[PDB]
Design a binder for this molecule. Structure first.
Ligand code: HEM
Ligand code: HEM
Ligand code: HEM
Ligand code: HEM
Lengths: 141, 146, 141, 146
């Protein structure tokens, strides 16, 4: 469960990302592909080069999903429902990998927004991303 | 990871009682039933809609025979699992794009299928030797992923 | 979510365990200690020998907890609440280990109750034990 | 796991800019705040009740200095991490009873703390070299667990 303070923390970190949310998603993805190369097994159809248009566009889609999860953090299952159907019935990404993309999102935010990324904020963001991950694998079985 | 001489003997004697054809069909079907996202790799196999469909699919029973035949030849070379599974590591990565997590899932289903078949003969010590063996095979299949 | 058929499957497998639930918990524990020896780090105060009274008594406690989770499978959080407080605030077992004890429970049941342990039952039991695990780590953060 | 000559250079140059005292206090405090069950090992440290209590505890800052000093000497021997961390593996298992999962949690907090401090210098490639290094150190600390 995300506490009321977690929610405030998450709403204000993510509010500072703002119009760079695109840029940060593309960077988190690139970090994930270099650091955990078994995740590339899900993108055989993409150019995974640095600067790649496919990764840039997909990082924007992933970041806008999180922005909406943040706007609807008291009701995230309902808000992410379509996306969770998609991951469970078509993409079928093994659940172990949501932790991987979750860690590279935290690294990207630590690197770009350090004044914000205090120990209490780091803890609220880790809980929030673990919880997004849970909604997105809730329909797997 | 390494096996004591006694874990090796253990492993080799149970395997001597295994029908590699039937146990391979059974392990792969259980993997598709218990972790249904693994079916993403097997759209050509046909009807995988329900557990009886999956457990009676001829193409799933034939792929299990093939997967467990390769494993069974791994067991002749427990010293050298990385050289034994090296061409196959390369194929799973380069041509099939299989996330190596699936190898660990399969390993655990096979331990359950061995339990189910041997019962009291599948003692806590024999299970511990097989857990080491399936992790070794999963690690050698993933070693050569880039 | 456990489906109505999952619940029926779980209620009938576990009903066959019956008065051996003690015996099966003690055996699952022993399997867990030999196969995943990092779990012994949580029991430094126990004799972990085969036949040990401490393991026999603790296997009975763990099995009676699962029997009660099974009797209250439509309301498991409320039923396991005390136990979840215990794991989060005192024992503080790392969450990664509930998967380990979950796998050795399935092996013990495969080995003792094979006629019951069909592919559909195996799938319902794996979901049920993953879900008990979730209630028991729900108060960690 | 192995580092290319270029990943090694990467690692060694960032580390040359790290205050091992301050970054160790910071990584261990974040570990106690972000994964609060890790506090089971540190009942003697005192007030760990809130993030400011934890991040200002003198005994937590001194243990981080000690943990990250040992890591920092690991980095002089990346070829031989298992012999370097062998006595310590033995102690964590035999005398302290620390589950080796905690070593992987600490490794990830340290990557976040390095990110936070170096910013743009902590590039996707430099992160990938540090991820390999912290997994290697976690594996050598766990190797000698029985
Ligand atoms: C926070 C975690 C995640 C979020 C928010 C997320 C969100 C999204 C979104 C919004 C899409 C686009 C769906 C659409 O266009 O309708 C998507 C597609 C996709 N996701 Fe996820 N995702 C996450 C985790 C992952 C992970 C861990 C993987 C694989 C390692 C992954 C693999 C994919 C793939 C392969 C696609 C399709 C890519 C394509 O063909 O364009 N996702 N995801
Ligand atoms: C012990 C584990 C495994 C072994 C030893 C193994 C071995 C094999 C072998 C021998 C082949 C035949 C390839 C050839 O003959 O050129 C194959 C193909 C394949 N394997 Fe694996 N495999 C294993 C695990 C898995 C798992 C867990 C998955 C996915 C869930 C998987 C997916 C596939 C697929 C999709 C193919 C190609 C299917 C086809 O040929 O139509 N394998 N594997
Ligand atoms: C299905 C999963 C689990 C269930 C149902 C369960 C249930 C229980 C129960 C009923 C107790 C006794 C509490 C009491 O007497 O009030 C307990 C205690 C304990 N559990 Fe858990 N547990 C589970 C998972 C784990 C795991 C994975 C570990 C460690 C690897 C663990 C470690 C302990 C320890 C150390 C105690 C205290 C032992 C003692 O001093 O007697 N538990 N658990
Ligand atoms: C890179 C990872 C780690 C390294 C290099 C490391 C190194 C050390 C060293 C050098 C000591 C001093 C022991 C001595 O001087 O004889 C120590 C003690 C200790 N470590 Fe670790 N450690 C690591 C990770 C951890 C983690 C993740 C935990 C637990 C959360 C942990 C728990 C402890 C505890 C409880 C002690 C004893 C505390 C005390 O002396 O009062 N260590 N460690």
């Amino acid at each position: 469960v995300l506490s009321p303070a977690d929610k405030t923390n998450v709403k204000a970190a993510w509010g500072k990302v703002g119009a760079h949310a695109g840029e940060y998603g593309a960077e988190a993805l690139e970090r994930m592909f270099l650091s955990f190369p078994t995740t590339k097994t899900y993108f055989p159809h993409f150019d995974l080069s640095h600067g790649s248009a496919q990764v840039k566009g997909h990082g924007k889609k992933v970041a806008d999903a999180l922005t909406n999860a943040v706007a609807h953090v008291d009701d995230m299952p309902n808000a992410l429902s379509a996306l969770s159907d998609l991951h469970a019935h078509k993409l079928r990404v093994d659940p172990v990998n949501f932790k991987l993309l979750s860690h590279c999102l935290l690294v990207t935010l630590a690197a770009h927004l350090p004044a914000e990324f205090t120990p209490a904020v780091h803890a609220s963001l880790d809980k929030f991303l673990a919880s997004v991950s849970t909604v997105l694998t809730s329909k797997y079985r | 990871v390494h096996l004591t001489p006694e874990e090796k003997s253990a492993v080799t004697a149970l395997w001597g009682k295994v029908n590699v054809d039937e146990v391979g069909g059974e392990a792969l079907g259980r993997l598709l039933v218990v972790y249904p996202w693994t079916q993403r790799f097997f759209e050509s196999f046909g009807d995988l809609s329900t557990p009886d469909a999956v457990m009676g699919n001829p193409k799933v029973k034939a792929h299990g025979k093939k997967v467990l035949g390769a494993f069974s030849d791994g067991l002749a070379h427990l010293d050298n699992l990385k050289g034994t599974f090296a061409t196959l590591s390369e194929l799973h990565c380069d041509k099939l794009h299989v996330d190596p997590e699936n190898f660990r899932l399969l390993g655990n289903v096979l331990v359950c299928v061995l339990a189910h078949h041997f019962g009291k003969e599948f003692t806590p010590p024999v299970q511990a030797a097989y857990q080491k063996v399936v992790a070794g095979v999963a690690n050698a299949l993933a070693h050569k992923y880039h």
